[PDB]
Amino acid sequence: MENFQKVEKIGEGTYGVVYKARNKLTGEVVALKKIRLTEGVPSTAIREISLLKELNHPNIVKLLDVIHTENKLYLVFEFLHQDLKKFMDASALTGIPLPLIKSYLFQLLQGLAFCHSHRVLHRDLKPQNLLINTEGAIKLADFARAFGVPVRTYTHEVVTLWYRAPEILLGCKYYSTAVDIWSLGCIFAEMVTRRALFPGDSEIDQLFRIFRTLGTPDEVVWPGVTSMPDYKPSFPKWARQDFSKVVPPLDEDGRSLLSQMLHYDPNKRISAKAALAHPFFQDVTKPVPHLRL
Numbered sequence: 001m002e003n004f005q006k007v008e009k010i011g012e013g014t015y016g017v018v019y020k021a022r023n024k025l026t027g028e029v030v031a032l033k034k035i036r037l038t039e040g041v042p043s044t045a046i047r048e049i050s051l052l053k054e055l056n057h058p059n060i061v062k063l064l065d066v067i068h069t070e071n072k073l074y075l076v077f078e079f080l081h082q083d084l085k086k087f088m089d090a091s092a093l094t095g096i097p098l099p100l101i102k103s104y105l106f107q108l109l110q111g112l113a114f115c116h117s118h119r120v121l122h123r124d125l126k127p128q129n130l131l132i133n134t135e136g137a138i139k140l141a142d143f144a145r146a147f148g149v150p151v152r153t154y155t156h157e158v159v160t161l162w163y164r165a166p167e168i169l170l171g172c173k174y175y176s177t178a179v180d181i182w183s184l185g186c187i188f189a190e191m192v193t194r195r196a197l198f199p200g201d202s203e204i205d206q207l208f209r210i211f212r213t214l215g216t217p218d219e220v221v222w223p224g225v226t227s228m229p230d231y232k233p234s235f236p237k238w239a240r241q242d243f244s245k246v247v248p249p250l251d252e253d254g255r256s257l258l259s260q261m262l263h264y265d266p267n268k269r270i271s272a273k274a275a276l277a278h279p280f281f282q283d284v285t286k287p288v289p290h291l292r293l
Protein backbone atom coordinates (compact mmCIF):
# COMPACT_ATOMS: atom_id res chain seq x y z
CA MET A 1 0.00 0.00 0.00
CA GLU A 2 1.25 3.50 0.84
CA ASN A 3 1.96 3.28 4.58
CA PHE A 4 3.51 -0.12 3.84
CA GLN A 5 6.64 -1.47 2.19
CA LYS A 6 5.77 -4.88 0.75
CA VAL A 7 8.67 -7.09 1.86
CA GLU A 8 7.53 -10.22 0.02
CA LYS A 9 4.48 -12.07 -1.21
CA ILE A 10 3.25 -14.57 1.35
CA GLY A 11 0.93 -16.11 -1.23
CA GLU A 12 -2.79 -16.01 -2.01
CA GLY A 13 -5.91 -16.52 0.07
CA THR A 14 -9.46 -17.05 -1.15
CA TYR A 15 -10.11 -13.31 -1.56
CA GLY A 16 -6.79 -11.87 -2.69
CA VAL A 17 -3.02 -11.79 -2.43
CA VAL A 18 -1.37 -11.84 1.00
CA TYR A 19 1.83 -9.86 1.51
CA LYS A 20 4.38 -9.65 4.30
CA ALA A 21 4.64 -5.93 4.90
CA ARG A 22 6.52 -3.55 7.16
CA ASN A 23 4.53 -0.57 8.41
CA LYS A 24 6.93 2.29 7.47
CA LEU A 25 5.27 4.24 10.29
CA THR A 26 5.50 1.91 13.31
CA GLY A 27 7.96 -0.47 11.65
CA GLU A 28 5.96 -3.44 12.91
CA VAL A 29 5.66 -6.40 10.55
CA VAL A 30 2.21 -7.51 9.45
CA ALA A 31 0.46 -9.80 6.98
CA LEU A 32 -1.46 -7.56 4.57
CA LYS A 33 -4.33 -9.00 2.56
CA LYS A 34 -5.70 -7.20 -0.52
CA ILE A 35 -9.36 -8.06 -1.08
CA ARG A 36 -10.65 -8.52 -4.63
CA LEU A 37 -13.52 -6.20 -5.57
CA THR A 38 -16.01 -4.04 -11.70
CA GLU A 39 -19.01 -3.89 -9.35
CA GLY A 40 -20.17 -2.08 -6.20
CA VAL A 41 -18.40 -2.56 -2.86
CA PRO A 42 -20.22 -4.54 -0.12
CA SER A 43 -21.75 -2.44 2.66
CA THR A 44 -22.40 -5.31 5.05
CA ALA A 45 -18.97 -6.87 4.52
CA ILE A 46 -16.87 -3.96 5.85
CA ARG A 47 -19.24 -3.55 8.80
CA GLU A 48 -19.25 -7.27 9.64
CA ILE A 49 -15.51 -7.58 9.03
CA SER A 50 -14.91 -4.56 11.29
CA LEU A 51 -16.69 -6.58 13.95
CA LEU A 52 -14.02 -9.27 13.59
CA LYS A 53 -11.41 -6.82 14.93
CA GLU A 54 -13.08 -7.27 18.33
CA LEU A 55 -12.33 -11.00 18.31
CA ASN A 56 -9.39 -11.57 20.70
CA HIS A 57 -8.06 -14.98 21.66
CA PRO A 58 -4.60 -16.60 21.86
CA ASN A 59 -5.53 -19.03 19.09
CA ILE A 60 -7.00 -16.55 16.64
CA VAL A 61 -4.76 -14.44 14.39
CA LYS A 62 -5.55 -10.88 15.42
CA LEU A 63 -7.13 -8.73 12.72
CA LEU A 64 -5.46 -5.40 13.40
CA ASP A 65 -7.15 -3.25 10.76
CA VAL A 66 -9.71 -3.14 7.96
CA ILE A 67 -8.65 -0.37 5.58
CA HIS A 68 -11.08 0.84 2.98
CA THR A 69 -9.15 3.58 1.19
CA GLU A 70 -9.05 4.67 -2.44
CA ASN A 71 -12.08 2.38 -2.75
CA LYS A 72 -9.87 -0.67 -2.12
CA LEU A 73 -10.03 -3.23 0.70
CA TYR A 74 -7.07 -4.25 2.86
CA LEU A 75 -7.07 -6.43 5.93
CA VAL A 76 -4.06 -6.06 8.23
CA PHE A 77 -3.26 -9.12 10.39
CA GLU A 78 -0.60 -9.84 13.00
CA PHE A 79 2.17 -11.73 11.23
CA LEU A 80 2.98 -15.28 12.22
CA HIS A 81 6.14 -17.26 11.38
CA GLN A 82 4.96 -20.22 9.32
CA ASP A 83 1.79 -22.06 8.30
CA LEU A 84 0.88 -25.66 9.21
CA LYS A 85 1.03 -26.69 5.56
CA LYS A 86 4.74 -25.86 5.25
CA PHE A 87 5.41 -27.22 8.74
CA MET A 88 3.80 -30.57 7.91
CA ASP A 89 5.73 -30.72 4.64
CA ALA A 90 8.87 -29.95 6.64
CA SER A 91 8.01 -32.74 9.10
CA ALA A 92 7.15 -35.35 6.43
CA LEU A 93 10.19 -37.58 7.04
CA THR A 94 9.78 -37.76 10.80
CA GLY A 95 6.18 -36.65 11.22
CA ILE A 96 5.00 -34.18 13.86
CA PRO A 97 5.47 -35.77 17.27
CA LEU A 98 2.15 -36.81 18.82
CA PRO A 99 2.53 -34.45 21.82
CA LEU A 100 2.77 -31.53 19.38
CA ILE A 101 -0.08 -32.80 17.17
CA LYS A 102 -2.14 -33.05 20.36
CA SER A 103 -1.16 -29.56 21.52
CA TYR A 104 -2.08 -28.05 18.14
CA LEU A 105 -5.48 -29.76 18.04
CA PHE A 106 -6.22 -28.73 21.64
CA GLN A 107 -5.37 -25.10 20.88
CA LEU A 108 -7.29 -25.05 17.57
CA LEU A 109 -10.37 -26.43 19.35
CA GLN A 110 -10.02 -23.60 21.93
CA GLY A 111 -9.87 -21.14 19.06
CA LEU A 112 -12.97 -22.69 17.45
CA ALA A 113 -14.81 -22.94 20.76
CA PHE A 114 -14.23 -19.17 21.22
CA CYS A 115 -15.28 -18.21 17.69
CA HIS A 116 -18.35 -20.44 17.87
CA SER A 117 -19.40 -19.14 21.28
CA HIS A 118 -19.40 -15.75 19.54
CA ARG A 119 -21.44 -16.97 16.58
CA VAL A 120 -18.47 -16.76 14.22
CA LEU A 121 -17.75 -19.61 11.83
CA HIS A 122 -14.64 -20.05 9.76
CA ARG A 123 -16.06 -22.26 6.97
CA ASP A 124 -12.73 -22.76 5.16
CA LEU A 125 -10.22 -24.16 7.61
CA LYS A 126 -7.08 -25.56 6.02
CA PRO A 127 -3.38 -26.05 6.88
CA GLN A 128 -2.57 -22.89 4.91
CA ASN A 129 -4.58 -20.72 7.28
CA LEU A 130 -3.45 -22.40 10.50
CA LEU A 131 -0.41 -20.42 11.68
CA ILE A 132 2.26 -21.31 14.22
CA ASN A 133 4.99 -19.43 16.00
CA THR A 134 8.25 -20.40 17.70
CA GLU A 135 6.61 -20.62 21.13
CA GLY A 136 4.41 -23.57 20.16
CA ALA A 137 1.17 -21.66 19.69
CA ILE A 138 -1.07 -22.18 16.67
CA LYS A 139 -3.76 -19.75 15.51
CA LEU A 140 -6.66 -19.71 13.07
CA ALA A 141 -6.51 -17.07 10.32
CA ASP A 142 -8.06 -16.03 7.01
CA PHE A 143 -11.64 -16.62 8.19
CA ALA A 144 -16.48 -16.26 4.54
CA ARG A 145 -19.83 -15.02 5.86
CA ALA A 146 -19.12 -11.30 5.53
CA PHE A 147 -18.04 -11.59 1.87
CA GLY A 148 -19.86 -14.61 0.44
CA VAL A 149 -18.00 -17.49 -1.19
CA PRO A 150 -15.82 -16.72 -4.29
CA VAL A 151 -15.86 -19.33 -7.08
CA ARG A 152 -12.18 -18.51 -7.68
CA THR A 153 -9.42 -16.20 -6.47
CA TYR A 154 -8.98 -12.83 -8.18
CA THR A 155 -6.65 -14.68 -10.55
CA HIS A 156 -7.66 -18.28 -11.27
CA GLU A 157 -6.40 -20.39 -8.33
CA VAL A 158 -7.38 -23.99 -7.48
CA VAL A 159 -9.47 -23.90 -4.29
CA THR A 160 -8.84 -26.94 -2.09
CA LEU A 161 -11.88 -29.15 -1.32
CA TRP A 162 -10.03 -31.62 0.90
CA TYR A 163 -11.42 -30.15 4.12
CA ARG A 164 -14.99 -29.37 3.10
CA ALA A 165 -17.76 -30.87 5.29
CA PRO A 166 -20.22 -33.28 3.62
CA GLU A 167 -23.30 -31.13 4.14
CA ILE A 168 -21.59 -28.38 2.09
CA LEU A 169 -20.65 -30.73 -0.74
CA LEU A 170 -24.25 -31.95 -0.70
CA GLY A 171 -25.48 -28.41 -1.28
CA CYS A 172 -26.61 -27.44 2.19
CA LYS A 173 -27.32 -23.72 2.02
CA TYR A 174 -26.99 -23.12 5.74
CA TYR A 175 -23.75 -23.74 7.57
CA SER A 176 -23.27 -24.58 11.20
CA THR A 177 -20.27 -24.58 13.53
CA ALA A 178 -20.14 -28.28 12.68
CA VAL A 179 -18.44 -27.50 9.34
CA ASP A 180 -15.33 -26.26 11.20
CA ILE A 181 -15.11 -29.37 13.38
CA TRP A 182 -15.12 -31.55 10.25
CA SER A 183 -12.30 -29.60 8.58
CA LEU A 184 -10.26 -29.76 11.76
CA GLY A 185 -10.89 -33.51 12.03
CA CYS A 186 -9.49 -33.83 8.50
CA ILE A 187 -6.45 -31.76 9.46
CA PHE A 188 -5.97 -33.76 12.66
CA ALA A 189 -5.91 -37.02 10.68
CA GLU A 190 -3.52 -35.46 8.19
CA MET A 191 -0.97 -34.43 10.84
CA VAL A 192 -1.09 -38.02 12.13
CA THR A 193 -0.80 -39.92 8.86
CA ARG A 194 1.23 -37.27 7.04
CA ARG A 195 -1.21 -37.60 4.16
CA ALA A 196 -4.45 -35.73 3.37
CA LEU A 197 -7.43 -37.77 4.49
CA PHE A 198 -9.78 -36.90 1.60
CA PRO A 199 -7.77 -35.39 -1.27
CA GLY A 200 -10.56 -34.85 -3.81
CA ASP A 201 -9.83 -33.19 -7.14
CA SER A 202 -13.49 -32.19 -7.69
CA GLU A 203 -16.62 -31.77 -5.61
CA ILE A 204 -17.98 -35.19 -6.56
CA ASP A 205 -14.58 -36.86 -6.21
CA GLN A 206 -14.33 -35.21 -2.80
CA LEU A 207 -17.73 -36.52 -1.81
CA PHE A 208 -17.04 -40.04 -3.06
CA ARG A 209 -13.67 -40.23 -1.30
CA ILE A 210 -15.47 -39.46 1.95
CA PHE A 211 -18.13 -42.08 1.07
CA ARG A 212 -15.60 -44.78 0.19
CA THR A 213 -13.97 -44.30 3.60
CA LEU A 214 -16.85 -43.56 5.97
CA GLY A 215 -19.49 -45.45 3.99
CA THR A 216 -22.21 -43.86 1.84
CA PRO A 217 -24.52 -42.01 4.24
CA ASP A 218 -28.16 -43.01 4.44
CA GLU A 219 -31.18 -42.01 6.46
CA VAL A 220 -30.13 -44.20 9.41
CA VAL A 221 -26.84 -42.45 10.15
CA TRP A 222 -27.88 -39.08 8.75
CA PRO A 223 -31.58 -38.28 9.00
CA GLY A 224 -32.56 -35.95 6.18
CA VAL A 225 -29.54 -36.72 4.05
CA THR A 226 -31.63 -38.03 1.09
CA SER A 227 -33.44 -34.70 0.85
CA MET A 228 -30.30 -32.60 0.64
CA PRO A 229 -30.07 -30.45 -2.53
CA ASP A 230 -27.35 -32.35 -4.36
CA TYR A 231 -28.04 -35.83 -3.04
CA LYS A 232 -28.77 -38.37 -5.78
CA PRO A 233 -30.27 -41.83 -5.08
CA SER A 234 -27.81 -42.97 -7.72
CA PHE A 235 -24.82 -42.38 -5.39
CA PRO A 236 -22.83 -45.59 -5.21
CA LYS A 237 -23.32 -47.52 -1.97
CA TRP A 238 -19.94 -47.92 -0.27
CA ALA A 239 -19.69 -49.72 3.06
CA ARG A 240 -17.92 -47.95 5.92
CA GLN A 241 -14.27 -48.94 6.25
CA ASP A 242 -12.73 -50.07 9.50
CA PHE A 243 -11.60 -46.95 11.33
CA SER A 244 -8.32 -48.58 12.45
CA LYS A 245 -7.31 -48.55 8.81
CA VAL A 246 -7.92 -44.78 8.62
CA VAL A 247 -5.55 -43.21 11.10
CA PRO A 248 -2.90 -45.67 12.28
CA PRO A 249 -1.00 -45.42 14.57
CA LEU A 250 -3.30 -42.99 16.38
CA ASP A 251 -4.29 -44.44 19.76
CA GLU A 252 -7.92 -45.29 20.61
CA ASP A 253 -8.68 -42.03 22.45
CA GLY A 254 -7.52 -40.17 19.35
CA ARG A 255 -9.52 -42.40 16.98
CA SER A 256 -12.58 -42.03 19.20
CA LEU A 257 -12.24 -38.23 19.12
CA LEU A 258 -11.67 -38.18 15.36
CA SER A 259 -14.69 -40.38 14.61
CA GLN A 260 -16.85 -37.94 16.58
CA MET A 261 -15.39 -35.06 14.60
CA LEU A 262 -16.23 -36.87 11.37
CA HIS A 263 -19.87 -37.86 12.08
CA TYR A 264 -21.93 -37.37 8.91
CA ASP A 265 -24.81 -35.65 10.72
CA PRO A 266 -23.74 -32.08 11.63
CA ASN A 267 -25.96 -32.38 14.71
CA LYS A 268 -24.21 -35.51 16.00
CA ARG A 269 -20.75 -34.04 15.25
CA ILE A 270 -18.97 -33.16 18.52
CA SER A 271 -18.67 -29.48 19.35
CA ALA A 272 -15.34 -27.78 20.02
CA LYS A 273 -16.30 -27.31 23.67
CA ALA A 274 -17.17 -30.98 24.16
CA ALA A 275 -14.06 -32.11 22.26
CA LEU A 276 -11.87 -30.19 24.74
CA ALA A 277 -13.15 -32.47 27.51
CA HIS A 278 -12.41 -35.60 25.53
CA PRO A 279 -10.04 -37.97 27.35
CA PHE A 280 -7.62 -37.66 24.44
CA PHE A 281 -6.53 -34.37 26.01
CA GLN A 282 -5.91 -35.79 29.48
CA ASP A 283 -2.13 -35.68 29.01
CA VAL A 284 -2.02 -32.60 26.74
CA THR A 285 1.10 -30.42 27.06
CA LYS A 286 2.58 -27.54 25.06
CA PRO A 287 5.79 -28.63 23.30
CA VAL A 288 7.83 -26.18 21.30
CA PRO A 289 8.30 -27.07 17.65
CA HIS A 290 11.53 -27.01 15.67
CA LEU A 291 10.89 -24.26 13.14
CA ARG A 292 13.14 -23.53 10.19
CA LEU A 293 12.60 -19.91 9.22
Ligand SMILES: C=CCNc1nc(N)c(C(=O)c2ccccn2)s1
Nearest residue numbers: 018031077078079080082083141142
Ligand atom coordinates in the same frame (compact mmCIF):
# COMPACT_ATOMS: atom_id res chain seq x y z
C1 LIG B 1 2.73 -18.36 5.88
C2 LIG B 1 3.39 -17.54 6.92
C3 LIG B 1 3.54 -16.04 6.75
N1 LIG B 1 2.90 -15.31 7.83
C4 LIG B 1 1.54 -15.12 7.87
N2 LIG B 1 0.96 -14.45 8.89
C5 LIG B 1 -0.38 -14.38 8.74
N3 LIG B 1 -1.14 -13.76 9.67
C6 LIG B 1 -0.85 -15.01 7.57
C7 LIG B 1 -2.17 -15.12 7.15
O1 LIG B 1 -3.17 -14.60 7.90
C8 LIG B 1 -2.55 -15.84 5.89
C9 LIG B 1 -3.87 -16.36 5.73
C10 LIG B 1 -4.22 -17.04 4.52
C11 LIG B 1 -3.29 -17.21 3.52
C12 LIG B 1 -2.01 -16.73 3.64
N4 LIG B 1 -1.63 -16.04 4.83
S1 LIG B 1 0.45 -15.68 6.67
